[PDB]
Amino acid sequence: PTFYRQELNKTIWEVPERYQNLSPVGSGAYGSVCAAFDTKTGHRVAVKKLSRPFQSIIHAKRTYRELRLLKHMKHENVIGLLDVFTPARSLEEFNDVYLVTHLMGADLNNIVKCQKLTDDHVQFLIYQILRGLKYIHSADIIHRDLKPSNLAVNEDSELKILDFGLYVATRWYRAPEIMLNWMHYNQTVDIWSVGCIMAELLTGRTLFPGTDHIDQLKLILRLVGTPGAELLKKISSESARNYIQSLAQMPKMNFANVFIGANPLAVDLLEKMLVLDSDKRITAAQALAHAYFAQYHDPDDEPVADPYDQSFESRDLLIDEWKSLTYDEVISFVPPPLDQEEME
Numbered sequence: 393p394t395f396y397r398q399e400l401n402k403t404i405w406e407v408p409e410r411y412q413n414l415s416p417v418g419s420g421a422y423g424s425v426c427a428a429f430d431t432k433t434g435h436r437v438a439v440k441k442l443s444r445p446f447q448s449i450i451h452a453k454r455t456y457r458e459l460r461l462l463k464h465m466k467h468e469n470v471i472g473l474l475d476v477f478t479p480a481r482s483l484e485e486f487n488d489v490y491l492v493t494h495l496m497g498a499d500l501n502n503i504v505k506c507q508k509l510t511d512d513h514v515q516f517l518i519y520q521i522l523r524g525l526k527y528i529h530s531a532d533i534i535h536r537d538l539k540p541s542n543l544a545v546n547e548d549s550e551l552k553i554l555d556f557g558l559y560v561a562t563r564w565y566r567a568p569e570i571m572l573n574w575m576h577y578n579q580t581v582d583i584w585s586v587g588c589i590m591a592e593l594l595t596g597r598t599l600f601p602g603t604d605h606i607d608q609l610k611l612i613l614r615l616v617g618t619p620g621a622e623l624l625k626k627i628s629s630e631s632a633r634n635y636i637q638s639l640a641q642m643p644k645m646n647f648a649n650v651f652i653g654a655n656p657l658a659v660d661l662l663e664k665m666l667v668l669d670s671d672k673r674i675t676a677a678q679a680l681a682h683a684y685f686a687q688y689h690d691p692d693d694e695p696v697a698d699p700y701d702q703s704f705e706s707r708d709l710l711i712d713e714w715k716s717l718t719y720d721e722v723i724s725f726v727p728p729p730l731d732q733e734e735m736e
């Protein structure tokens with residue numbers, strides 16, 4: 393392919409002539425993103441240029457991690473790859489990596505902001521998040537920082553999870569076990585986040601808008617009640633445990649009185665998601681079977697992922713080894729068919 397250069401976001405992008413009309417649409421994880429027109433298929437795409445992908449072993453391994461992850465993800469509610477390219481003609485000059493996916497014009501904050509969503513619409517949005525999470529969780533991949541700005545949405549409210557498995561971030565949607573650095577956690581950290589997202593879609597208000605980690609924990613405990621001693625097991629820091637134990641005891645609120653006027657099935661699902669005990673939190677696959685999603689649920693169209701080999705995560709390799717491995721993954725990429733779906 394012939395490449396061309398264009399300055400975007402104050403830096404030179406070098407992309408195949410196939411991709412035209414590049415225009416910036418914001419930052420992504422470890423890179424920045426432009427919308428583009430794919431002249432081969434007439435489809436709109438998003439191209440992410442990774443920022444300094446091989447500057448250090450930290451960048452180099454995270455570049456490999458992201459490319460491996462995105463090459464594996466093949467689900468309608470999860471960001472995957474249409475293309476990956478580099479202007480380099482050999483490994484020796486390989487220093488830049490561009491990732492291509494279908495263009496999604498918005499994030500979930502653009503949906504929930506200037507509209508009173510209907511309950512049927514909220515169901516569809518949360519259903520899609522859970523379908524994507526069932527898939528990634530089935531490959532032992534967790535998001536850990538799921539939030540509206542990590543949900544890409546198009547003009548028809550079709551949604552994809554992004555930046556899973558990977559500047560001041562909001563902590564308002566993080567699972568308490570993550571926010572507070574608890575010793576053990578599981579895939580249901582992401583279900584807590586779904587509960588906070590869903591609550592906000594139903595009420596139009598952030599569920600736990602804490603000003604710091606302590607204020608956020610206090611807001612959480614006001615809703616769900618103070619935890620038992622069993623939960624202290626999870627917390628290494630004695631001062632943190634002593635603090636939580638020292639709090640005046642609070643009962644769990646009845647969610648029916650918090651989410652006044654919501655579909656009772658929505659309230660019931662929130663009660664199952666917003667539990668402090670992560671071993672008692674509903675899973676994505678269980679939530680998909682909940683009656684709240686009855687009109688959308690379809691067991692034939694809620695697939696799991698092929699096994700994903702993450703053995704590389706435990707390995708320390710040299711920068712040039714990560715770089716060569718990443719180059720191999722760029723070269724071996726097989727673009728998917730344009731049409732991968734059939735009528736049910």
Ligand SMILES: Nc1nccc(-c2c(-c3ccc(F)cc3)ncn2C2CCNCC2)n1
Pocket residue numbers: 417418419420421425427437438439440471472473491492493494495496497498499541543544554
């Ligand atoms: N507009 C749009 N459409 C699809 C994806 C993205 C995207 C990507 C991304 C990831 C992988 C890839 F291969 C290509 C792009 N990373 C962050 N974002 C956006 C997520 C919403 N806020 C703006 C940036 N942006």
Ligand SMILES: [Ca+2]
Pocket residue numbers: 557558705
């Ligand atoms: Ca990891």
Ligand SMILES: [Ca+2]
Pocket residue numbers: 690693736
């Ligand atoms: Ca169906």
Ligand SMILES: [Ca+2]
Pocket residue numbers: 731732733734735
């Ligand atoms: Ca088809």
Ligand SMILES: [Ca+2]
Pocket residue numbers: none
């Ligand atoms: Ca379609």
Ligand SMILES: [Ca+2]
Pocket residue numbers: 692736
């Ligand atoms: Ca069927």
Ligand SMILES: [Cl-]
Pocket residue numbers: 539540541542562
């Ligand atoms: Cl967000």
Ligand SMILES: [Cl-]
Pocket residue numbers: 572573574627628629632
């Ligand atoms: Cl701790």
